[PDB]
Design a protein around this nucleic acid. Structure first.
Ligand SMILES: [Mg+2]
Ligand SMILES: [Mg+2]
Ligand SMILES: [Mg+2]
Ligand SMILES: [Mg+2]
Ligand SMILES: [Mg+2]
Ligand SMILES: [Mg+2]
Ligand SMILES: [Mg+2]
Ligand SMILES: [Mg+2]
Ligand SMILES: [Mg+2]
Ligand SMILES: [Mg+2]
Ligand SMILES: [Mg+2]
Ligand SMILES: [Mg+2]
Ligand SMILES: [Mg+2]
Ligand SMILES: [Mg+2]
Ligand SMILES: [Mg+2]
Ligand SMILES: [Mg+2]
Ligand SMILES: [Mg+2]
Ligand SMILES: [Mg+2]
Ligand SMILES: [Mg+2]
Ligand SMILES: [Mg+2]
Ligand SMILES: [Mg+2]
Ligand SMILES: [Mg+2]
Ligand SMILES: [Mg+2]
Ligand SMILES: [Mg+2]
Ligand SMILES: [Mg+2]
Ligand SMILES: [Mg+2]
Ligand SMILES: [Mg+2]
Ligand SMILES: [Mg+2]
Ligand SMILES: [Mg+2]
Ligand SMILES: [Mg+2]
Ligand SMILES: [Mg+2]
Ligand SMILES: [Mg+2]
Ligand SMILES: [Mg+2]
Ligand SMILES: [Mg+2]
Lengths: 106, 62, 62, 119
RNA sequence: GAGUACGGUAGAGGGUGGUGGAAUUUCCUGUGUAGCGGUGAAAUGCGUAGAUAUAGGAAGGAACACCAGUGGCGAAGGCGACCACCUGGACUGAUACUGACACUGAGGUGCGAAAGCGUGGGGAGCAAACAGGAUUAGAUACCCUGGUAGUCCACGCCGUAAACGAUGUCGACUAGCCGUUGGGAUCGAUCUUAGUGGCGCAGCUAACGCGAUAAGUCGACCGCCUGGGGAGUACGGC
């Protein structure tokens, strides 16, 4: 009904709770009747520039079918989280499920 | 912007490569285009003159 | 582009987006690449969005 | 009567239209020797010429040779003349030019520049 | 003719929040020492009470390089960082529907660059007024060093511009050629729409020049002109 393709990258020093964080973030989509369409993790990346005196971060993307309340709660948790460091939301008028780039190399 | 020196290259390829990279980046043009404030009327006037000259040059080939 | 490959582009094909940036980290004008205007607009917005996520550098120096 | 050694430093060129300033530091950015075209004895229009830049750069390099400094990263900043003259002046002193970079600052939009001159 | 219903397309159209990177300035700290800055040449100014340069950290305000285009959108004024939310219009294709419901418009009603005014915030850069240094016969200027209102934000007022295409709105006709922005068809080519540019036949014009985006051929309605000054001034009204 209102699609949202979110890309979120998290601090490296505590980049082990990324599981815990993603499966505690996606607890609101299903209760709202929304379907998860993609959840891709390709973390341990190198930044193009130093964000708050770090050079690496753990990336992730997920596609969400949510409403105003769930979305606003998501950005509330993002803003008040000390590991958010960056975030983006990218509404689309269609649903995408077929990967982003994976590792085309070996 | 930055230049690589390698294979004990002589100190003639180094400067030429540095100059070529600098003009590719156009550092001098940008820094020259900011030594004084250039008001939007002059913006539009200069761009219109550039457009008319560019079209005249394009037509003049035929 | 036109015939078969990718009717639309996004901030995912980092190879294609990297193919359309100068070595100093600036978008290449459409008069050089010879592309269409609509695709040029999509390309510029894709590059800026990808640049915000630190996938691409704002400047080559940083 | 204090002595210390250093190897593989960095030399900065600040080449503005009026004057060019050459300085030498380590990788930590601590001044070792500096020289100015104004100090080289020009004091006027000559101060802007590339030859004054050459003289100042070679003088600073010869002053800094007391510490060894078998390697240099030279970085330039400014659009004034003598942008490349000081590079050759330093190469004449007998250093190893490890790399050459420009650090000319380019504002994206930034503050507005001063009013246009009417001369 | 005008409008409605249904899929799509593009866009700096408008409003409310949040978030980015470059750069300037200021403060703190390390190294280091005699100049920095500026000019046509200088000087004022900043420096051994340790400056400029150089490295690290911090604060804050404003504008949004490259894309960028005879490019786009808007009734005009105007509108360029990115994202979310609210919202107007225009193009585009087929079918169905209403059945003249249209055009213009004295008065009236709103929107309306910049500068300016009121109340309260904010203040990095720039910079009327102003101070000092030059130039000069003089220089209440051009040039240089500083610098306050203002420029920014919220709410309210003000009603003006070479607010210009110096060209009112609406409709219908009239040889062609070369581009370009959106969209369609038929087989890179041909055709067709709605814009945006360059030439040009008739025709028009005092001439310049306009020439399907008329200043040509015609219709409908409105506004305005009647020698130069005095003067868009005086008096009166609002
Ligand atoms: Mg100046
Ligand atoms: Mg300093
Ligand atoms: Mg610093
Ligand atoms: Mg306009
Ligand atoms: Mg104003
Ligand atoms: Mg005011
Ligand atoms: Mg005010
Ligand atoms: Mg006030
Ligand atoms: Mg100030
Ligand atoms: Mg002044
Ligand atoms: Mg000043
Ligand atoms: Mg000031
Ligand atoms: Mg006043
Ligand atoms: Mg305001
Ligand atoms: Mg205008
Ligand atoms: Mg008029
Ligand atoms: Mg007249
Ligand atoms: Mg009108
Ligand atoms: Mg008309
Ligand atoms: Mg109308
Ligand atoms: Mg009409
Ligand atoms: Mg018509
Ligand atoms: Mg013509
Ligand atoms: Mg006439
Ligand atoms: Mg006439
Ligand atoms: Mg008539
Ligand atoms: Mg009539
Ligand atoms: Mg008529
Ligand atoms: Mg009269
Ligand atoms: Mg008379
Ligand atoms: Mg009279
Ligand atoms: Mg009056
Ligand atoms: Mg009278
Ligand atoms: Mg009166």
């Amino acid at each position: 009904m209102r699609h949202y393709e979110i890309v979120f990258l998290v601090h490296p020093d505590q980049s082990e709770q990324v599981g815990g964080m993603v499966e505690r973030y996606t607890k609101a989509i299903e209760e709202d009747g929304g379907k998860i369409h993609r959840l891709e993790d390709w973390g341990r990346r190198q930044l193009a520039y130093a964000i708050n005196n770090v050079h690496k971060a753990h990336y992730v993307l997920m596609n969400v079918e949510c409403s105003a309340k769930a979305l606003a709660e998501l950005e509330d948790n993002f803003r008040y989280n000390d590991a958010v460091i960056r975030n983006l939301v990218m509404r689309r008028d269609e649903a995408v499920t077929e990967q982003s780039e994976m590792l085309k190399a070996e | 912007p930055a230049v690589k020196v390698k294979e004990n290259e002589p100190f003639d390829v180094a400067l030429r490569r540095f100059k070529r990279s600098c003009e590719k980046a156009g550092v001098l043009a940008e820094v020259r285009s900011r030594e004084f404030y250039e008001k939007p009327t002059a913006e539009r006037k200069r761009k219109a003159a550039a457009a008319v000259k560019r079209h005249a040059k394009k037509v003049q080939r035929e | 582009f036109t015939a078969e490959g990718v009717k639309e582009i996004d901030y995912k094909d980092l190879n294609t987006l990297k193919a359309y940036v100068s070595e100093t980290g600036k978008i290449v004008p459409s008069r050089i690449t010879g592309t269409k205007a609509k695709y040029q607009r999509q390309l510029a917005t894709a590059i800026k969005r990808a640049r915000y996520l630190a996938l691409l550098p704002y400047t080559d120096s940083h | 009567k204090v002595k210390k050694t250093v190897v593989d430093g960095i030399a900065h060129i600040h080449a503005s239209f009026n004057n060019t300033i050459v300085t030498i530091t380590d990788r930590q950015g601590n001044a070792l020797s500096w020289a100015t075209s104004g100090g080289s004895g020009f004091r006027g229009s000559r101060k802007s010429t590339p030859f004054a830049a050459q003289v100042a750069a070679e003088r600073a390099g010869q002053a800094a040779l007391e510490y060894g400094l078998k390697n240099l990263d030279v970085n330039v900043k400014g659009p004034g003349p003598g942008r490349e003259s000081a590079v050759r002046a330093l190469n004449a002193c007998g250093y190893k030019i490890a790399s050459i970079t420009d650090v000319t600052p380019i504002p994206h939009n930034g503050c507005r520049p001063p009013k246009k001159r009417r001369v």
